[PDB]
């Protein structure tokens, strides 16, 4: 099972020898006693290669080599006439010319394979241009498909955000994001205000597809309690737990860390609980920013609480995994000093001016 | 600039001649003194094609040296001698052989472009097999990402979907979704309000895709956010107006159809306003279809939504989301004459429509059933 050939020589003796040798090399041999019929055979079916010896009167000679090139059928053609006919062959479009009589049978083989190689080379090479084009025109199509997804995901992501600046009885809230990260704060029983800064791992629509569920996690818990609720006092530590076990329940493949805190206004007391891995929160009293003690992945299923009294005037704020200030060791000791330098107005001044681009999101609680 | 050819011809007069001819035909001619000149030059320059006279120039040995450097550079042999010699050269990969004085001007240039082409093809395709492989690797990776993104797409609905079958004071709600692997836009949700009013609705996002999934989440984010905004409290017909102006504000460009219905259990009545409906009550007797004064898709900024019936003891409603099953072709309206009979056979039971269900779908199907 190999490339088929077509021999056209007047000599039945010579045509007899070459055919056996070629067919012995797995090359299907088509024998053409007379030049004319060798042309008809090509019309019905197209062999991979055509060998022939220019002779007269039976053999067409140049007439044959012309027609094949004019019939839009391009196949290698080896000719076996002297220079006058050999030189022309190459001009008309012949692969190569071989002398007679050749005693070494192999010499014809090599010249035969060069033609096949440089023929199959043009067929495949031209196919790569069509297949590759077909690939990119199917890839760039799904790329623009992803872009429409990135945009769609961002729109619904910006919609879940709280109103800015929304302030309740002297408590101004301001969040600026520039996107898996999300920050929301909705009042509870009026007296208790809850806020958080979720920082979903990863990026893209999938990441923003986790944050959309997150709000559903938190919103539902409040909704789950029928006004009175299961309990009288809302608990931050258990809130992060519901979210936790829920992210395992559903194979999102993303771990989320968020700083949740409920501020009771009647008792002026704040109960918060660090999700696990975030740039520490910055409290702002006496003009000197102070870090708040905080502690995992938030993605475990095992069967803490930070309570603090608050002054009338304070400033508290969160970051979404954004370090621009010398890593880890000093990347946590420098932030505290910078925050007091200027809240929303100061950080804002520092923010931007970088084309580099997890996205950065900050919440200001004044 | 077309190509960089290297000629190694001992004969000054002749070599200069070839230089002028080739140079004119948009070529750079590098004249090599002798066999070694070309060899020392070749290593640094790496020309596209080398043409040298077979006189003794090292001759065949030079070709052997070029084959050793693993270069694919073609080699045209000029053996003007009327002799066994030329063939051995081609044996080493030499392109062709021209017999001097080779007065013929055209032939030489004919054998030159050939080799440069049969080489440019071997380079172009070898570069095509690399870009193609890189394209497929990058393509299949994005599909794997999309698949993973689609998996996360249908897994988010698990928490949002209501419990089935959830029944309150005699009313049984049941919904079963049959996804065709690919995400669908249809999303159904029913919720209780004031414990004295019950609302149910079926939505469907145009076509299918990841974007559609994002639209299904904002619907539950809209229908519920208007709930805690303020015993019939308000009317869905007015609600569809609010949800409409919200969707057109997002600029998503996704078309959503909804089948709303609020029930007052104290008075046993139903107020339904269906936007993209195009509402079947079993009645226990002859199957009846609900009438909606306004059936607008929701795309037009202007809201022309209107609502409209005391519920019977043995109630029996159903909502289908763009689910079309032949029976001739019976498309559209023809399809719509046939289903009333089928629902009756199904006896308004989610289960009986379920048994006919199942058994490749363009869009996943989601239905809601009410039993009383």
PDB file of C-alpha atoms in Angstrom, chain A residues 90 94 97 114 121-122 125 128-129 132 135-136 139 148-149 152-153 155-156 159-160 205-206 209 212-213 215-217 250, chain B residues 90 93-94 97 114 121 124-125 128-129 131-132 135-136 139 149 152-153 155-156 159-160 210-211 213-214 217 221 250 252:
ATOM      1  CA  UNK A  90      11.881  20.332 -17.915  1.00  0.00           C
ATOM      2  CA  UNK A  94       8.878  17.591 -16.115  1.00  0.00           C
ATOM      3  CA  UNK A  97      15.287  13.267 -17.090  1.00  0.00           C
ATOM      4  CA  UNK A 114      12.212  13.054  -4.733  1.00  0.00           C
ATOM      5  CA  UNK A 121       5.250  18.523   0.427  1.00  0.00           C
ATOM      6  CA  UNK A 122       3.152  21.016  -1.539  1.00  0.00           C
ATOM      7  CA  UNK A 125       2.130  22.522   3.249  1.00  0.00           C
ATOM      8  CA  UNK A 128      -1.447  23.623   6.970  1.00  0.00           C
ATOM      9  CA  UNK A 129      -2.365  27.069   5.657  1.00  0.00           C
ATOM     10  CA  UNK A 132      -4.133  26.589  10.823  1.00  0.00           C
ATOM     11  CA  UNK A 135      -7.859  26.803  13.918  1.00  0.00           C
ATOM     12  CA  UNK A 136      -7.292  30.507  14.593  1.00  0.00           C
ATOM     13  CA  UNK A 139      -9.942  30.075  18.502  1.00  0.00           C
ATOM     14  CA  UNK A 148     -18.198  38.777  26.021  1.00  0.00           C
ATOM     15  CA  UNK A 149     -18.157  36.574  29.118  1.00  0.00           C
ATOM     16  CA  UNK A 152     -21.000  40.125  31.196  1.00  0.00           C
ATOM     17  CA  UNK A 153     -19.473  38.824  34.419  1.00  0.00           C
ATOM     18  CA  UNK A 155     -21.457  43.983  34.767  1.00  0.00           C
ATOM     19  CA  UNK A 156     -23.319  41.732  37.205  1.00  0.00           C
ATOM     20  CA  UNK A 159     -24.257  45.587  40.267  1.00  0.00           C
ATOM     21  CA  UNK A 160     -23.980  43.635  43.525  1.00  0.00           C
ATOM     22  CA  UNK A 205     -15.822  35.312  34.982  1.00  0.00           C
ATOM     23  CA  UNK A 206     -15.335  32.103  36.976  1.00  0.00           C
ATOM     24  CA  UNK A 209     -18.979  33.531  39.433  1.00  0.00           C
ATOM     25  CA  UNK A 212     -22.081  36.153  42.968  1.00  0.00           C
ATOM     26  CA  UNK A 213     -22.689  33.022  45.036  1.00  0.00           C
ATOM     27  CA  UNK A 215     -23.532  37.375  48.297  1.00  0.00           C
ATOM     28  CA  UNK A 216     -26.177  34.668  48.015  1.00  0.00           C
ATOM     29  CA  UNK A 217     -24.472  32.894  50.915  1.00  0.00           C
ATOM     30  CA  UNK A 250     -19.911  23.089  45.270  1.00  0.00           C
TER      31      UNK A 250
ATOM     32  CA  UNK B  90      23.556  14.878  -7.087  1.00  0.00           C
ATOM     33  CA  UNK B  93      22.007  16.127  -2.446  1.00  0.00           C
ATOM     34  CA  UNK B  94      23.074  18.528  -5.190  1.00  0.00           C
ATOM     35  CA  UNK B  97      23.978  20.060 -12.933  1.00  0.00           C
ATOM     36  CA  UNK B 114      13.520  26.015  -8.085  1.00  0.00           C
ATOM     37  CA  UNK B 121       8.446  25.299   1.150  1.00  0.00           C
ATOM     38  CA  UNK B 124       7.346  27.338   5.545  1.00  0.00           C
ATOM     39  CA  UNK B 125       5.658  24.006   6.269  1.00  0.00           C
ATOM     40  CA  UNK B 128       3.434  25.798   9.917  1.00  0.00           C
ATOM     41  CA  UNK B 129       3.610  22.554  11.894  1.00  0.00           C
ATOM     42  CA  UNK B 131       2.318  27.425  14.739  1.00  0.00           C
ATOM     43  CA  UNK B 132      -0.485  24.919  14.167  1.00  0.00           C
ATOM     44  CA  UNK B 135      -2.542  27.019  18.058  1.00  0.00           C
ATOM     45  CA  UNK B 136      -4.223  23.716  18.923  1.00  0.00           C
ATOM     46  CA  UNK B 139      -7.153  26.385  21.590  1.00  0.00           C
ATOM     47  CA  UNK B 149     -16.147  27.811  33.421  1.00  0.00           C
ATOM     48  CA  UNK B 152     -18.939  26.356  37.464  1.00  0.00           C
ATOM     49  CA  UNK B 153     -21.828  27.789  35.469  1.00  0.00           C
ATOM     50  CA  UNK B 155     -22.981  24.328  39.742  1.00  0.00           C
ATOM     51  CA  UNK B 156     -23.959  27.826  40.874  1.00  0.00           C
ATOM     52  CA  UNK B 159     -27.833  26.776  45.663  1.00  0.00           C
ATOM     53  CA  UNK B 160     -30.139  29.225  43.886  1.00  0.00           C
ATOM     54  CA  UNK B 210     -21.983  31.463  29.892  1.00  0.00           C
ATOM     55  CA  UNK B 211     -23.422  34.975  29.625  1.00  0.00           C
ATOM     56  CA  UNK B 213     -25.871  31.995  33.260  1.00  0.00           C
ATOM     57  CA  UNK B 214     -24.864  35.438  34.528  1.00  0.00           C
ATOM     58  CA  UNK B 217     -28.364  35.154  38.654  1.00  0.00           C
ATOM     59  CA  UNK B 221     -31.027  39.183  42.313  1.00  0.00           C
ATOM     60  CA  UNK B 250     -26.904  46.436  31.995  1.00  0.00           C
ATOM     61  CA  UNK B 252     -25.876  42.762  28.158  1.00  0.00           C
TER      62      UNK B 252
END
